[PDB]
Scaffold this active site. Structure first.
Site, short mmCIF file in Angstrom:
data_model
loop_
_atom_site.label_atom_id
_atom_site.label_comp_id
_atom_site.label_asym_id
_atom_site.label_seq_id
_atom_site.Cartn_x
_atom_site.Cartn_y
_atom_site.Cartn_z
N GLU A 130 0.83 -1.20 0.00
CA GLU A 130 0.00 0.00 0.00
C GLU A 130 0.88 1.26 0.00
O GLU A 130 0.62 2.20 -0.77
CB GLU A 130 -0.89 -0.08 1.25
CG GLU A 130 -2.06 0.81 1.18
CD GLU A 130 -3.00 0.59 2.37
OE1 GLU A 130 -2.82 -0.42 3.07
OE2 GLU A 130 -3.98 1.36 2.53
N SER A 171 -5.41 2.44 8.43
CA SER A 171 -3.95 2.46 8.63
C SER A 171 -3.44 3.74 8.00
O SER A 171 -4.20 4.42 7.28
CB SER A 171 -3.24 1.24 8.01
OG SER A 171 -3.39 1.29 6.59
#
EC number: 3.6.1.-
Length: 419
Positions: A130, A171
């Site tokens: 990511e 996150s």
């Protein structure tokens, strides 16, 4: 002239977004060539929110997939790759129940295979994935991988790259090119792009995305205060305690309780400070929670919820955010507003309005106490959500990787002229 298309479904914690990309077939390996064609936001929650009703996860996508059918020329549907990538919401659900996670992935897969696109799979990205793919997106779009100069006069040092900071719902990632030695293999990234080697640091802080931080602050306020100092005075709501403590992020912290805001910027600052453990570092240098981080360096783009929160401060509150001291002052001002004062500034829908104080406080402390930006390094951070008509996030980088659209080396090594 003749275009190719590709599709990524970004299955984030709070919702799914669809991006359709397009590029010329005979220039597809040039940097910066791929660009966004269209996008669609899926109504309702993220796919992980269907953990107990997985069939709904696939059905949720149908409206956006119907739009994709209209956005991509028909004769191209069959040769258009389609990917789904899921992030921290699905990482969290996998901690709770691998079985439920698998059923959700099975449901979206079933739906996606019914469409005419070249479906290439639904996958959960790692935190490293990511972070790195967002860094690739930003630098690809801004043409930072071009080798600038000409024979006999190449620029030295070579063109700098943009660090990336992404604040998702569950996150947050920080990723940047560094000259510092690696001290933790989990943070070490090496890329070969267009014949050049990039040494990169990345980290993803699970449970530090905007929605999980709000949940953790609510849990903390309930325990310590029984009022919420980050919420505005005059705002109150009925809190369902089951929802507060069900997350892996808060289970470490009587069916229903009333909770009211108090506009206490100083107590809000103290509450947020408890999110960062700075007591121990087994490395030469850490960010927080004992995580290795070398000194921040270079320009950065802060996108996703960093952009949306700072845009509220500048556009709605009308406050400058150019320095860390200015961001702090804007946050203090915002937190000190009463609920009526805050509502007076927002004539339209008020969802999320009670949350900007806490999120702005979090961002200020994340950057300053967490990552150790100071005034000098902060001057090099920009808050932006788009580059070259394309939304900044991990989706483009992901597609570029899986579609092999970025060459590791230039064709024929450019006859060795970059050696």
């Amino acid at each position: 002239p003749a275009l190719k298309y590709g599709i990524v479904l970004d299955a984030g914690s709070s919702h799914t977004s669809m991006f359709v990309y397009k590029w010329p077939a005979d220039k597809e390996n040039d940097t910066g060539i791929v660009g966004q064609h269209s996008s669609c936001d899926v109504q309702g929650g993220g796919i992980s929110s269907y953990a107990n009703d997985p069939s709904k996860a696939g059905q949720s996508l149908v409206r956006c997939l119907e739009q994709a059918l209209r956005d991509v020329p028909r004769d191209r549907h069959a040769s258009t790759p389609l990917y789904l990538g899921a992030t921290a919401g699905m990482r969290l659900l996998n901690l709770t129940s691998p079985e439920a996670t698998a059923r959700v992935l099975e449901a979206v897969t079933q739906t996606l295979t019914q469409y005419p696109f070249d479906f290439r799979g639904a996958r959960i990205l790692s935190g490293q994935d990511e972070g790195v793919f967002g860094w690739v997106t930003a630098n690809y779009l801004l043409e930072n991988f071009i080798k600038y100069g000409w024979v006999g006069r190449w620029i030295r040092p070579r063109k700098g790259t943009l660090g990336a900071m992404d604040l998702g719902g569950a996150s947050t990632q920080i990723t940047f090119e560094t000259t510092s030695p690696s001290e933790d293999p989990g943070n070490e990234v090496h890329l070969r792009l267009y014949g050049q080697h990039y040494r990169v640091y990345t980290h993803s802080f699970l449970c530090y995305g905007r929605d999980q931080i709000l949940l953790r602050l609510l849990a903390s306020a309930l325990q310590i205060h029984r009022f919420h100092p980050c919420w505005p005075k005059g705002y109150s709501t009925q809190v369902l305690l089951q929802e507060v403590y069900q997350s892996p992020c808060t289970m470490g912290q009587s069916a229903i309780v009333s909770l009211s805001g108090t506009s206490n910027a100083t107590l809000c600052r103290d509450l947020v400070s408890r999110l960062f453990n700075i007591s121990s570092c087994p490395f030469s240098q850490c960010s927080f929670n004992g995580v290795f981080q070398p000194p921040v360096a270079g320009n950065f783009i802060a996108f996703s919820a960093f952009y949306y929160t700072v845009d509220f401060l500048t556009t709605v509150m009308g406050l400058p955010v150019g320095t860390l001291k200015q961001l702090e002052e804007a946050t203090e001002i915002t937190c000190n507003q009463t609920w009526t004062e805050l509502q007076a500034r927002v004539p339209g829908q008020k969802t999320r309005l009670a949350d900007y104080c806490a999120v702005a406080m979090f961002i200020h402390q994340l950057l300053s106490r967490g990552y150790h930006f100071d005034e000098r390094s902060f001057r090099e951070v920009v808050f932006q959500k788009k580059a070259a008509d394309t939304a900044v996030g991990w989706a483009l980088g992901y597609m570029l990787n899986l579609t092999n659209l970025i060459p590791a080396d230039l064709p024929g090594l450019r006859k060795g002229t970059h050696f």
